[PDB]
Structure formats: C-alpha cells, structure tokens
Design a protein around this ligand. Structure first.
Ligand SMILES: Nc1nc2c(ncn2[C@@H]2O[C@H](COP(=O)(O)OP(=O)(O)OP(=O)(O)O)[C@@H](O)[C@H]2O)c(=O)[nH]1
Ligand SMILES: [Mg+2]
Ligand SMILES: [Mg+2]
Lengths: 125, 65, 285, 97, 125
RNA sequence: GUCCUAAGGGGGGCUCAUGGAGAACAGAAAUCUCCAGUAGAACAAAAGGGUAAAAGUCCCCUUGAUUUUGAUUUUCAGUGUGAAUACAAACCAUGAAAGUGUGGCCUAUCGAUCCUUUAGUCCCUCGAAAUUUGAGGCUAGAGGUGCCAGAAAAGUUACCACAGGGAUGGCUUGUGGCGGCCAAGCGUUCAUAGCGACGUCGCUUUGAUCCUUCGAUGUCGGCUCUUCCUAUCAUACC
RNA sequence: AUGGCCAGAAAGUGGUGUUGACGCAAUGUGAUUUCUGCCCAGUGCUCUGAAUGUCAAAGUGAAGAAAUUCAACCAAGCGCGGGUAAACGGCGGGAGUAACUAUGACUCUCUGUAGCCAAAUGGAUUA
RNA sequence: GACUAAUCGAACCAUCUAGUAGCUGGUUACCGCCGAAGUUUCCCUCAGGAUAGCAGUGUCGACCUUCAGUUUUAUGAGGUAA
C-alpha cells in the first residue's frame, strides 16, 4: 500500500500540509479526543527540584485579577419587555392550558409568570 | 475560587476536578453533567435563585428571582 | 466602498432573502409617438413611487440587442422596464421587460390601439392617491392556458407591475380602486386594461353593494413579439428563498401556546398476551 | 471559505465572543479604561508622552531623520499591509472560484 | 431511544432509576443491558451507592439505593410487607403473620404449604 | 515629520469651478462687491442620464468605540446561565414632523543571518596539456509562503528500580447582610459639605404541613488509665 | 500433503508425523437449565470484478559527443467498483407522496384471586 | 509475571570497566598581607544564559595629570509655606 506512518496517513487522508497538530494524535485519536483524554491527566503543577511550584496547575493560578466594571449605558436599560396584548394572550394560553401525559417539556419559555398565572383563591387570600 | 477534588483509589490521587467554593446561579432546566465529564462542580447547597434587590429611588427592598 | 453612503447603496443593491419592491424604468426609443408617451406617462402615474424616468432618446432595439438594457438595469437597480417605440410596422408599441440578475429574463411587446386610447385626464373623476396599491382583477379564458404563452406572461408581468409593496395588513380604506385586465382565448385577441373607482352602497345586509366607475386610463393592446426565459435561468428566478422567521419543521417537536418547546413520545399498544405469568406452587391445583 | 476560515474549521478554533472582542481594556497603572486600538489606542501608547526612554543601540541602528515616536506607527502600518495583502489574496481566490 | 432523539442536542441522556428497595431497579438495568452489570439480591439495600452503566453511546443508566419517604400513617407492618426491612433483624416476626394471612387468600396458603385446618396464625405456624 | 472632543448619523442654512466689471498697497496670481454662470467645482464611482433650497460646503445635537430579546436560520459546543451568525422586534440619535440612520472591517503562524531563481562577458579552478559539456568558488542581480521550499519523535507502570531532597498563632467566644431615615456628638462655620455610637424601617401557620432529607479532596474511633480548666448538668449556699 | 502449524545461522535439517477432517492447529465461551431486543451496511472481513488511476528494480524508445535528460511500460499492494464474520458499530417506528434513478425532501399518523397459547413444563428465584 | 540452586518484569560467573552522574559524602601543617557580592545591560522561558559592578597578585608609565557619594556661588525642579 502506501505506509502505516503518520505522514503517509496524512497524505492518504488529504490533510493540508503544514497544519499544526496536538501531541499524541494518531489513527485512533482526533484533536478533540486528545484534549478530552488530557483533561483527565490535567491537575498537577510544575515544580522545581526543591518542590516549589514554578507553574501552577490548571485553574489554580493564584494571581489576583483586577475586578473592575466599566461604565456602560446597557446597565441602566430594560433587558426584557412585554406588551399588554402579549400578556393577555399568555393569560389566555394559561387559561386553556391542559395536561397531556405523552408530551414532555424540553425548554421552558422565560416569561414573567407572576403577571401571567392566575391569582390565589379568595379564601386563601 | 476553585479547590482540587482528589479522585482515585491509589495513594497518588488524580486532581483534575475543580469545585466552586462560592455561590453560583445555574439557570432554569439545569441537568448536571455526568461525573466522568464534570470538571467544574457546582454544589447543590450553594445554588441560589432569588436575591434581595433594593430600588434606590423608591427605597423598597423586594425579593426577586 | 470607502464612503458610508456608498456602502449603504451597495448593501441595498445586494441580494437579500426578502427582496426589495421592484423598480421600473420608463424609457423611449429614438422615434416614439405622442400616444406612446402618454401611455408611459399614465403607467408612471400609476407606479410613480417605485419608478425612474429617462428623458433622452435611446437608439435601442431590444429584440436585436439588450446590452444597453442590461447596462441601465445594472446602473439604476431597475428590474422592470417600459420601453416606448413607434414604427411603420409597429405604430405604438410598449415593450415590457422583466430582468433577473441584471440580465434580460423575458420580454413582451404590446401594441396600443390609438383610436380607443383614453388617458387619465380624459375622465373627470377622483383619482388614486400617490403610492396607494390598487386591487387587481384578471378576467377571461386567455389567462388559464395550461401551456405558458403570451397571455399568461402578460398576466404575470402586469401583476409585477401592479404589485406595489407587499404587506401583511391593509386598511379597509385601501380598497377604493381596481385594475381590470380582460382577455379571451380565440383574429388576434385584444387585451383590455381598465381602471375603476370603487364605491359602496347600502344593500340591507352585512356585505356592501359595490358599484364601479371608470378612472382611467383606457388601453387596448394586441400581444406582440416574444422573448421567453431560458429554463435554467427561469428555475433560478422562480426559486423561493426561505425566511429565518419561519421554523423548520422537526418531527415530534412543537411549540405550545405558552412558547415552551414540547416533545411528543409514542408508547405504543401494550401487548401482554405473550406474557406467561409465574407458575407458582400456590397456583397449581 | 477563506484560508483562515478553513484553518479554523480544521483546527476547531471557535469564534471569539462579542464581550471578548471588545475595543476596551482596563489599564491598571493609570487606573483608567482605554481602547486597545483606534484613536488614542493602547497600540500607540507613548507616542504623545513627554518622556520616552530609548536604548543607545536602538538609536545607533536607527536611520537618520527618523525618531522613536513613529516606530509604533511603522509597525502598525506593516501589520495593516500584511493583513490587506492576505485579504486581497482571499478576494482574488474567491473571484476565481 | 425516543428520549435520546428528543435530546439529540446533548452529548447523551441520563436515566436514573428510583423507587422502594427490592422493586427491581438493578434487575431492570441488568435486563436492559442483557448482562449482569449491577448486583441483584432479594435482600433489601443491596445497592448502597449510585452507579453509572453505559447502555448505548448516548444513553446512561444510573442505579440508586432504595428510598422510603417518611409518613406518619405508615406502620412497621406496612413497611415490612412492602419489603423495606430484612426479616432476620426484626423482633417477634410472628406478629406480622396475620397481615400476611389477610393479604393472601386461604386456599393459596393451603396449596403453597400443603397444609390446612388451622384456626389462627399461631396454630398455622 | 506633524495635528486632531474619532469617524459616522440626523436636522438647518448657503451655492460651487470660471469669466466680466470695479476696490490704497495689490501689480497675470492675496482680499472684498456686483453680474452671468446645469454643475463644466467638490464628494463618490467608473453612465450610454450620480448629486444643486444636495449626496457638495459650513453650523446645532449625539459621539454611547460595536446595546437587549428570541421557543426562529446556519455552524459549533466534554466550560450546553449556550456561543458565533442571519433575520425580526425593541431601544437609541436627530428633527416641529413626515421620516432618516447606526449599533464594525479583516486575517492561520514561523524564516529575511531564510527560501526560490538569473547572469558573469574582459572572473578563477577542476592540480600531465588543450577544446567542448559539466561542476565548484567568487561577484552582481530578481521575487517574497497562490508560482518561496518546508514545518507529524506517542503513552503507561498498583510488577518495578536508582541518585537525591522533604514531611495562622497575646489567633479565638453572644447577638446577620444590604439599602434608607433619625441622631447626642466630631467637624465646619469666606465652602455647610463630610464621619457618626444609640436606634428604627424594608426583604429574607388562627398553635400548620408531614406529597420538596439538595454532592466525602480534607476522617475518625473504641479500650485501659491519670491529671487539669470552668465556659456549673447534679449535689451545697444565695 | 511440493499443505497447515512450528523450529533452525544454514543444511541431502528437524518436529507435529508410527499423523490425514469422528484429524491437527488457533481462538472465544465455559456443567445442566435458560438463552439469542429489532434493523442495517459506517469501520472492518473478503472479491475467480473491472481499471491502469498511484505504480520500485529490470527491460523499451528519443535527443546529445557522452556523462545525462525526457517519455511511455510498470507485478503485488493501495485506490475504484462488488458480496459480508455483519465481528465492531450505529439504530424511535409506520404509511405514503412527487422530486424521477444517485442525496430522497415533504405530508400524515402513533398511546385470571389466577388466563390464553405452546411438546409435563413455561425455568437464571438453577440442585 | 509464577519457577529456573536462599538470586527473576529477565538467573549466575568473568571481562569491556577504574563505564556515567550535573546528585550525596569526604577532601590532611602554621603564621603573615589584602579581601568580596545578589535584575547593571542584553538576549523565548522553565530543567536558561552571558555581562556590568565589587577583589587579589604582578608589572610598567613623568605614580604626569590632580580629583571628590561634601559645602558655597549662579541657575533649574519643587513658587510649596510664609
Ligand atoms: N418474579 C420477578 N422477580 C423479580 C423481578 N425483578 C426483580 N425481581 C426480584 O426482586 C429482587 C430485587 O432485585 P433488585 O435488582 O435488587 O431490586 P432493587 O429494588 O434495586 O433492590 P435494592 O438493591 O435493595 O435497591 C431480586 O432478587 C429479584 O429476584 C421480576 O421482574 N419478576
Ligand atoms: Mg435488593
Ligand atoms: Mg439494587
């Protein structure tokens, strides 16, 4: 055939020449698979001969960041708005909402449910 | 922020899992990742959904989701 | 496009999923008669918002060469054209041109009857407001041909001429003017273009009684020379783009009345006839 | 697809988020918010500052007439020229296709 | 598999099995896998910790220990008859025999033990 | 080598190049006034009909340097409150208004002491001599990763082994956080600001419900036995 | 059986072999009882199928004065095109309609207080 | 991964062989005269380098010029108190 080398495999698969590769990639391993399996091996810091950490482990960087918030006009506006017609339509939708055992909920709609759900009963109130 | 979670039965433990030590908000329809692929652990005891929000002009504090 | 205004112009001229309303260019040849000029003036009065008008003489014969038409369409972003001509063989001719991607898609000639032609100013009536879209009626048996011919083509291009701006809603005050095109299958048939104003009267029922009165212009045409589209270019022209605001249908996926995404499961019929229960010692006689 | 888009698709390079690609950064030393590029950007830091400390070897290798205040503009223009040449190559390939 | 298709956007789906002890959760997992992957025993509390079993490439099964929701109307006799506890570690097991004799028809007991003619539970035992 | 509250957007006012006639210096060419001026100027593109109370040029307002929402489009996602993207809506700017307009453009990277390539006539050498090919050296040119070549040497060891190096504190205790108000007082009294104990006010079931227990990286025990502390359960006194 | 599995530096070398499919060799599973979710066709298995598409050495042809250069030709394998141990894998179905056939795309729809059936039993709750 | 002469994830014996180690341990009389130092500047870092600076012995040159971690004067910065 052509050869079982990695270069021959790349030439057979028609990869772009000069593209960088992650260490450990082979016929059985893709880049994302190599990253996923290297996640399991992550977590050990880099130390010198005397045991002092010279490079910290992943997500243990010990460096204190600058926690600042920029001035922005987006902070003083309304993120979500709803109209009265849409509110009334949602109230009607909750009114003839019915239950069905063979239908499952996959993603809830982010709605102001306090303005849509019917109020409590008179005796409870 | 993160603490190292040790896993394994040997004396030498694997340390890839990180647990969040601060309160977190996970959002609606939250299903946790399985343990084999859960790197960041957000515990159920530190999850909050509501906050006491004060309106500066009206001087009213209301618990809001 | 260094300038922001030129960038805006190129972005407006760029192809879109939801296209802009079509622009019509009104132009005439080197020799164009006064009746043909009046007919183009009436059509421009009907469609003045989305039309541009040329005022010079163009030495163009569209059925021989249309490179100048393609150049004008590219320069003016016009996808419909009304071209006026006059000749000994063809005394008063309106050349309706529809184009696709700055190339000529199809063309059709109309021969106008000079004796029965009445302009809009010849009727002392209240006229259509500027920019208002008229209603359309196409009548006769000439437009129901199973094979695409001159009359079906004329119906399609008159529809594109009188479309205006598409809209999801309309006020009931925008139903006051109607354009009626009548033609019959048969020596050559006459395509009659009329405009009427609509008035409503009491009839004692819920539905109003409609009465019409002529608005102008009065045009009589004989359908002339032809240029049909190529099948491939016609296919690309009649391809319909899909709006992002319409959801691709997925099986067992829906949205309920509250906006929640709902999935449907199918249990199937329960068949316990193939189940053998345990032969316990207490159940054996 | 351009050369970068093909390379990113092959290498799994996700596009940057809109909060990440903002033209805004916090300068700690001045304690002020400044832009990464553009008018008065961080890429042209010190072009209008009163005191610039230079290296003796740097003006030794510097040609006559040029000053230290234009080196950042020179390097920015070089990067702009390289990016523009790559963009023109991509446009030529797309027009060929 | 229908649930997996409904959640095809995820990498997989997880199915956790819950119920009382000794209802058949580990047995259901083993039956669905076709292989004895979870420990099964008639004694309650065989499953003490949660266990992952990879059923398919996109389906995981989670075995859980048997739970008993507390209720003031539930008696130790009711819990024992539902199968919460082991009968070896209970005191005076003969007091629960009348509950069994009420729950089971008499002829079923007679055909099970080939014995008849008792008046009460102590005589039967 | 310099200069700029950036470009852009909206609204308003004005008309440009040029020619003629005039005005101390000023004389072809400086500034000013009038007339005539289809744009022959300027701005964008490459009209065979771009723009004149404007698309030109000056003023006013914004300059907030890339907003929010989406069960929708496309792609991706072992970090799935989804991200990027398209579309739509809302918001925003401006104007009296009709309206108008924005909420980016791009790109793998590495060498330049590098890579590829050309010429040498009157350049030198191929060492027994010469000629013709060829080859090396030296010199002088050309282009710049589309046509300038290239840039794929992984793990595991709980079967193990060797050479070494290691193994916060006169802290803590009984009384929450955030935000507002009052406030003796401290200050201030050419500014009347700023701190402030004591408090107070908002958020965090008619004796109910029991059908909402919310994640081990950090590990304790048991026996025997002695002593100490008081932050006292019991016995003594009050 | 001028065969398989091996061994040897080689050998006119040795073993299986004083052997021949009810045998030898290599595997997986592991008494008996129970037992083979449905469905293929992506990786892989193999194909007495077409191609020269990739294509070494030797050989062939042309140019030059020759070194040399350029062309075809090029076995096995690969590739292309077929049938599967369908092992791994992947896998909601059921009807259609129409694009013609290659990719389909679209529309509709799914919810017996101890019996019946099987060659006494209906079992792994296995002595 | 068991056994193969108390030796087994490759037995024992002799040799190459005084193999290699940047790692560990150690490194032998007296007196006298001087006598220290930690980003200064450049380079892809850690499993990195040079290099400035500080020192001792000898000399040689007219050991010639004098210089100085100091003050004052003139003038900057600080016009800041007053
Ligand atoms: N007859 C019959 N018995 C069953 C069935 N399923 C389970 N069993 C029996 O019930 C017992 C319970 O089995 P488990 O798998 O341990 O069920 P569980 O609820 O998980 O028990 P825990 O481990 O305590 O939680 C088993 O010993 C089986 O013998 C069944 O379908 N039919
Ligand atoms: Mg059990
Ligand atoms: Mg169990």
């Amino acid at each position: 055939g052509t050869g079982k080398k990695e270069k021959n495999r790349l030439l057979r698969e028609g990869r772009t020449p000069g593209d960088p590769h992650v260490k450990g990639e082979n016929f059985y391993r893709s880049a994302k698979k190599i990253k996923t399996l290297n996640i399991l091996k992550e977590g050990k810091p880099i130390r010198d001969s005397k045991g002092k950490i010279v490079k910290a482990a992943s997500f243990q960087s010990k460096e204190v960041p600058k926690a600042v918030i920029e001035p922005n006009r987006k902070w003083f506006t309304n993120t979500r708005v709803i109209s009265q017609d849409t509110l009334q339509s949602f109230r009607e939708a909750m009114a003839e909402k019915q239950k069905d055992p063979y239908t499952v909920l996959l993603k809830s709609n982010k709605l102001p449910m306090s303005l849509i759900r019917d109020g409590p009963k008179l005796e409870d109130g | 922020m993160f603490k190292v979670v040790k896993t394994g039965k040997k004396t030498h433990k694997k340390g890839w899992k990180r647990i969040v030590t601060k309160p977190t908000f996970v959002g609606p329809d939250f299903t946790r990742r399985p343990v084999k692929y859960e790197r960041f652990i957000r515990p159920m005891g530190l999850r909050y959904k509501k906050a006491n929000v004060t309106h500066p002009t009206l001087n009213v504090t209301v618990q809001l989701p | 496009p260094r300038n922001a205004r030129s960038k805006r112009a190129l972005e407006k001229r760029a192809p879109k999923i939801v296209e802009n309303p079509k622009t019509c260019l009104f132009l005439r040849g080197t020799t164009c008669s006064q009746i043909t000029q009046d007919a183009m003036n009436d059509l421009y009065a009907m469609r003045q918002v989305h039309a541009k008008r040329f005022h010079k003489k163009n030495a163009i014969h569209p059925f021989e060469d249309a490179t100048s038409l393609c150049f004008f369409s590219e320069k003016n972003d016009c996808s419909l054209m009304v071209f006026g001509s006059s000749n000994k063989k063809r005394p008063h001719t309106l050349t309706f041109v529809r184009m696709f991607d700055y190339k000529v898609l199809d063309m059709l000639e109309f021969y106008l009857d000079p004796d029965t032609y009445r302009s809009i100013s010849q009727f002392k009536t209240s006229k259509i407001p500027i920019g208002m879209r008229p209603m359309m009626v196409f009548a006769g048996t000439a437009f129901e041909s199973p094979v695409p011919n001159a009359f079906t083509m004329a119906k399609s291009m008159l529809i594109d001429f009188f479309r205006g701006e598409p809209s999801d809603k309309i006020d009931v005050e925008g139903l006051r003017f109607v354009v009626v095109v009548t033609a019959d299958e048969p020596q050559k048939p006459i395509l009659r273009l009329r405009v009427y104003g609509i008035r409503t009267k009491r009839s004692g029922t819920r539905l109003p009684r409609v009465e019409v009165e002529e608005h102008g212009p009065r045009m009589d045409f004989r359908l002339g020379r032809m240029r049909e589209p190529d099948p491939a270019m016609l296919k690309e022209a009649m391809k319909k783009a899909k709006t992002p605001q319409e959801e691709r249908t997925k099986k067992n996926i829906s949205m309920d009345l509250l906006g929640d995404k709902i999935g449907r499961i199918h249990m199937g019929k329960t068949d316990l006839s193939k189940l053998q229960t345990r032969k316990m010692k207490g159940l054996k006689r | 697809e351009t050369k970068w888009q093909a390379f990113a698709r092959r290498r799994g390079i996700k596009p940057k988020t809109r909060e990440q690609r903002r033209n805004l950064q916090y300068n700690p030393t001045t304690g002020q918010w400044e832009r990464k590029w553009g008018y008065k950007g961080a890429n042209k830091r010190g072009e209008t500052d009163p005191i610039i400390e230079v290296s003796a070897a740097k003006e030794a290798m510097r040609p006559e007439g040029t000053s230290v205040r234009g080196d950042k503009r020179r390097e920015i223009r070089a990067r702009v020229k390289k990016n523009q040449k790559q963009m023109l190559r991509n446009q030529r390939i797309a027009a060929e296709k | 598999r229908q649930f997996s298709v409904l959640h095809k956007d995820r990498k997989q789906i997880s199915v956790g099995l819950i119920g009382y002890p000794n209802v058949g959760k580990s047995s259901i997992i083993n039956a669905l896998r076709g292989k004895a992957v979870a420990k099964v025993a008639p004694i309650p509390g065989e499953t003490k910790v949660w266990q992952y079993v990879t059923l398919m490439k996109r389906i995981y099964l989670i075995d859980c220990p048997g739970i008993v929701p507390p209720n003031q109307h539930d008696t130790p006799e009711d819990l024992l008859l539902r199968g919460v506890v082991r009968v070896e570690n209970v005191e005076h097991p003969e007091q629960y025999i009348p509950a069994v004799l009420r729950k089971v028809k008499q002829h079923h007991m007679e055909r099970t033990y080939e014995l008849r003619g008792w008046k009460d539970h102590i005589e039967f035992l």
